[PDB]
Motif scaffolding. Structure first.
Motif, PDB file in Angstrom:
ATOM      1  N   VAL A 277       1.982  14.850  -9.582  1.00 40.76           N
ATOM      2  CA  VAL A 277       1.429  13.500  -9.632  1.00 40.76           C
ATOM      3  C   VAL A 277       1.676  12.771  -8.319  1.00 40.76           C
ATOM      4  O   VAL A 277       0.945  11.838  -7.967  1.00 40.76           O
ATOM      5  N   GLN A 278       2.699  13.188  -7.567  1.00 43.07           N
ATOM      6  CA  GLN A 278       3.042  12.506  -6.326  1.00 43.07           C
ATOM      7  C   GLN A 278       1.974  12.710  -5.258  1.00 43.07           C
ATOM      8  O   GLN A 278       1.900  11.941  -4.292  1.00 43.07           O
ATOM      9  N   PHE A 279       1.143  13.744  -5.406  1.00 49.08           N
ATOM     10  CA  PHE A 279       0.146  14.029  -4.379  1.00 49.08           C
ATOM     11  C   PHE A 279      -1.127  13.223  -4.580  1.00 49.08           C
ATOM     12  O   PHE A 279      -2.016  13.243  -3.722  1.00 49.08           O
ATOM     13  N   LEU A 280      -1.235  12.507  -5.700  1.00 50.27           N
ATOM     14  CA  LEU A 280      -2.490  11.848  -6.041  1.00 50.27           C
ATOM     15  C   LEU A 280      -2.736  10.616  -5.179  1.00 50.27           C
ATOM     16  O   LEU A 280      -3.857  10.393  -4.708  1.00 50.27           O
ATOM     17  N   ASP A 281      -1.710   9.797  -4.964  1.00 51.06           N
ATOM     18  CA  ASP A 281      -1.816   8.595  -4.141  1.00 51.06           C
ATOM     19  C   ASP A 281      -1.063   8.812  -2.837  1.00 51.06           C
ATOM     20  O   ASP A 281       0.082   9.279  -2.841  1.00 51.06           O
ATOM     21  N   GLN A 282      -1.715   8.481  -1.721  1.00 51.33           N
ATOM     22  CA  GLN A 282      -1.076   8.616  -0.419  1.00 51.33           C
ATOM     23  C   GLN A 282      -0.076   7.492  -0.173  1.00 51.33           C
ATOM     24  O   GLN A 282       0.983   7.717   0.424  1.00 51.33           O
ATOM     25  N   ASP A 283      -0.396   6.280  -0.623  1.00 59.53           N
ATOM     26  CA  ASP A 283       0.468   5.118  -0.412  1.00 59.53           C
ATOM     27  C   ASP A 283       1.379   4.896  -1.621  1.00 59.53           C
ATOM     28  O   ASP A 283       1.299   3.898  -2.335  1.00 59.53           O
ATOM     29  N   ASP A 284       2.266   5.863  -1.838  1.00 58.98           N
ATOM     30  CA  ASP A 284       3.183   5.826  -2.965  1.00 58.98           C
ATOM     31  C   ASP A 284       4.484   6.500  -2.561  1.00 58.98           C
ATOM     32  O   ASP A 284       4.470   7.544  -1.906  1.00 58.98           O
ATOM     33  N   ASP A 285       5.604   5.897  -2.951  1.00 59.79           N
ATOM     34  CA  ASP A 285       6.893   6.549  -2.767  1.00 59.79           C
ATOM     35  C   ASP A 285       7.086   7.627  -3.822  1.00 59.79           C
ATOM     36  O   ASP A 285       6.927   7.380  -5.021  1.00 59.79           O
ATOM     37  N   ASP A 286       7.434   8.829  -3.375  1.00 57.22           N
ATOM     38  CA  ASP A 286       7.551   9.985  -4.252  1.00 57.22           C
ATOM     39  C   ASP A 286       9.017  10.361  -4.432  1.00 57.22           C
ATOM     40  O   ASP A 286       9.714  10.663  -3.459  1.00 57.22           O
ATOM     41  N   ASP A 287       9.477  10.333  -5.679  1.00 58.05           N
ATOM     42  CA  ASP A 287      10.788  10.839  -6.051  1.00 58.05           C
ATOM     43  C   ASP A 287      10.605  11.798  -7.221  1.00 58.05           C
ATOM     44  O   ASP A 287      10.025  11.414  -8.249  1.00 58.05           O
TER      45      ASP A 287
ATOM     46  N   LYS B 152       1.726  15.782   4.561  1.00 57.86           N
ATOM     47  CA  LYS B 152       0.962  14.568   4.825  1.00 57.86           C
ATOM     48  C   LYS B 152       1.353  13.450   3.868  1.00 57.86           C
ATOM     49  O   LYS B 152       1.393  12.277   4.255  1.00 57.86           O
ATOM     50  N   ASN B 153       1.640  13.794   2.611  1.00 59.19           N
ATOM     51  CA  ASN B 153       2.028  12.795   1.625  1.00 59.19           C
ATOM     52  C   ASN B 153       3.342  12.131   2.007  1.00 59.19           C
ATOM     53  O   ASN B 153       3.475  10.904   1.935  1.00 59.19           O
ATOM     54  N   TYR B 154       4.333  12.927   2.418  1.00 59.61           N
ATOM     55  CA  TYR B 154       5.573  12.333   2.905  1.00 59.61           C
ATOM     56  C   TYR B 154       5.342  11.578   4.207  1.00 59.61           C
ATOM     57  O   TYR B 154       5.905  10.498   4.421  1.00 59.61           O
TER      58      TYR B 154
END
Ligand SMILES: [Ca+2]
Ligand SMILES: [Ca+2]
Lengths: 443, 82, 82
Positions: free
Chosen positions: A275-285, B40-42
């Motif tokens: 799910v973290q790859f869906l939005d570019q402008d999102d903090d992923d943890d 790219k996401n990071y």
């Protein structure tokens, strides 16, 4: 698929239902973000209890309506959804202890059953669209479904996707055209259950191709729904959902003579971690739960894992489950289930006044606050005022507020992503740029 | 978190190697598209140099909004170059 | 008619030096060069495969198919390439 279709009718509704069904405590974080309002929304849950003696008097609805200010709760023997014109009441309050307050405080064109539209069976070749034919045809405010399938892909069962979209309370002109883009062989395998339905078109190709997505007029579509049927064959974590991520990212990047990011898209994920790859402008943890994620909160992502909580809720209140089958997939009367058991194929019958009367059931819709009589209430800053005025005037019951992500920030921003807030309090700040989830009767 | 460990933010470039000798070239290209999407996401600003076993997969990775070949991104397509 | 040795590297082999054998192994070194000079990779894509300009890349990205159009003076002008 019913949740997906309801989200198509009103974006972010699948998140609303999933958060209602899951049991969540109240969490408050100090730093001002959209996450506070979202977490306030998710804390509310679905419940059921019997009404008190005060509410069983001269008339049910009039006493039930507008009393939600004193009760501090919201109400949704038969299944009743936004009624108009000892009986159960479905409550959307937070904690079952405070929910126990209403009782204590006394101060041929349709189908045979008439539930869904129907038409004569059609050949697959009749509805096959080529790039040129799709391009010349005017498609606007419609539904486009990208389907990833092969010869060995299992059956998705798109029938449960198409029924909720075409309900009886939807007029034939109000219908949204559905176009399935994908491999012709897989669509043929599932076409046999689909040929009885109207306004369905098939486009062979792949959603990765930009030409096909231009031909089906994505920039003006009401919803794009991405599905992959090959998830059961592939087992590795990395191999899962690559096609879905690529399709979503290609749709976002596509440019029209505007940017494709503003296009509304819902993607089905079998693995929450993607799910973290869906939005570019999102903090992923990775530790962050799926419901806390931005793509789910905005309603752009759906996963079946949340539906697991249903197994608990269904036990504690059986009625709850059937109400879901009423809120999605249109109506599910026992006669319809009997006909499915006997035939497995939907069949249409000649209209009678009884069937035409069975259309008063409400349907979910988005209400825009910028244009309409509620424009003054938009900047007022009191949600409960909007709730009371809507209930008194149009008898429209509003679930919650679908709100811009960066509205709370002082500096204006170009973000279009909106998250849902469920049953906001009476003293809730309101901005003009908000959407209202509502249930509307037949007209 | 592992990208925070190797300091992608201060890294000038990121190089993704590919296993040319693989049973399914599309599978390896798909692993590489996962790598590129994650990096790219990071961090979208960082340069990426990657090997490409198929030319149409290069088209797929060109569809990424973060991919920006003009400034510092490169794709080395093995089949195309050979 | 050559002296064979498994210890001998491919670039030193007789059929490779004659230009009659090719493999992707050598192309691996491209990554190193591609890191130190970005533009050099462009030159490669210009020296081989003819001229694939930004416009042609955009067209292939949009369509994945070559398209032919009626000639204009501008199209006939960009022929100076050696
Ligand atoms: Ca609660
Ligand atoms: Ca992200």
């Amino acid at each position: 698929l019913g949740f997906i279709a309801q989200s198509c009718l009103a974006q972010g509704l699948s998140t609303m239902l999933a958060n209602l069904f899951s049991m969540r405590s109240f969490i408050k974080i100090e730093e001002d973000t959209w996450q506070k309002y979202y977490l306030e929304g998710v804390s509310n849950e679905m419940y059921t209890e019997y009404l008190s003696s005060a509410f069983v008097g001269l008339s049910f609805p009039t006493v039930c309506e507008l009393c939600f200010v004193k009760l501090k709760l919201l109400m949704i023997s038969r299944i009743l959804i936004n009624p108009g014109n000892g009986t159960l009441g479905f409550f959307i309050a937070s904690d079952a202890k405070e929910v126990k307050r209403a009782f204590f405080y006394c101060k041929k064109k349709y189908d045979s059953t008439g539930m869904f539209h129907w038409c004569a069976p059609k050949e697959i070749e009749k509805v096959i669209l080529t790039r040129s034919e799709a391009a010349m045809t005017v498609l606007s405010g419609h539904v486009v479904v990208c389907i990833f399938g092969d010869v060995s892909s299992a059956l998705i069962g798109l029938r449960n996707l198409v029924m909720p979209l075409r309900a009886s309370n939807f007029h034939y002109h109000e219908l949204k055209h559905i176009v399935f883009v994908g491999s012709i062989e897989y669509l043929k395998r599932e076409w046999e259950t689909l040929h009885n339905f109207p306004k369905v078109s098939i486009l062979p190709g792949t959603p990765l191709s930009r030409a096909d997505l231009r031909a089906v007029n994505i920039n003006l579509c009401d919803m794009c729904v991405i599905l992959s049927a090959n998830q059961n064959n592939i087992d590795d974590t990395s191999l899962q959902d690559k096609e879905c991520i690529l399709a979503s990212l290609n749709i976002k990047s596509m440019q029209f003579d505007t940017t494709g990011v503003n296009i509304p898209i819902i993607t089905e994920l079998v693995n929450d971690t993607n799910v973290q790859f869906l939005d570019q402008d999102d903090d992923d943890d990775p530790d962050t739960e799926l419901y806390l994620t931005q793509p789910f909160a905005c309603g752009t992502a759906f996963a079946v894992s949340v539906l697991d909580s249903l197994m608990s809720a269904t036990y504690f209140n059986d009625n709850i489950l059937t109400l879901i089958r009423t809120l999605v997939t249109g109506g599910a009367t026992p006669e319809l289930e009997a006909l499915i058991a006997e035939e497995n194929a939907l069949r249409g019958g000649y209209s009678t006044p009884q069937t035409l009367a069975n259309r008063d059931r409400c349907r979910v819709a988005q209400l825009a606050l910028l244009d309409g009589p509620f424009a003054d209430l938009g900047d007022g800053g009191c949600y409960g005022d909007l709730f009371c005025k809507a209930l008194k005037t149009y008898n429209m019951l509003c679930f919650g507020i679908y709100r811009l992500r960066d509205a709370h920030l002082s500096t204006p921003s170009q973000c279009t992503k909106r998250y849902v807030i469920t049953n906001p309090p009476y003293e809730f700040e309101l901005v003009p740029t908000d959407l209202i989830f509502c249930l509307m009767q037949f007209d | 978190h592992d990208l925070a460990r190797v300091k992608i933010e201060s890294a000038d470039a990121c190089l993704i190697l590919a296993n040319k000798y693989c049973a399914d070239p599309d599978a390896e290209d798909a692993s590489n598209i996962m790598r590129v999407i994650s990096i790219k996401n990071y961090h979208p600003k960082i340069r990426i140099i990657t090997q490409m076993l198929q030319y149409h997969n290069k088209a797929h990775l060109l569809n990424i909004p973060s991919w920006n070949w003009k400034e510092g991104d490169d794709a080395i397509c093995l089949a195309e170059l050979k």
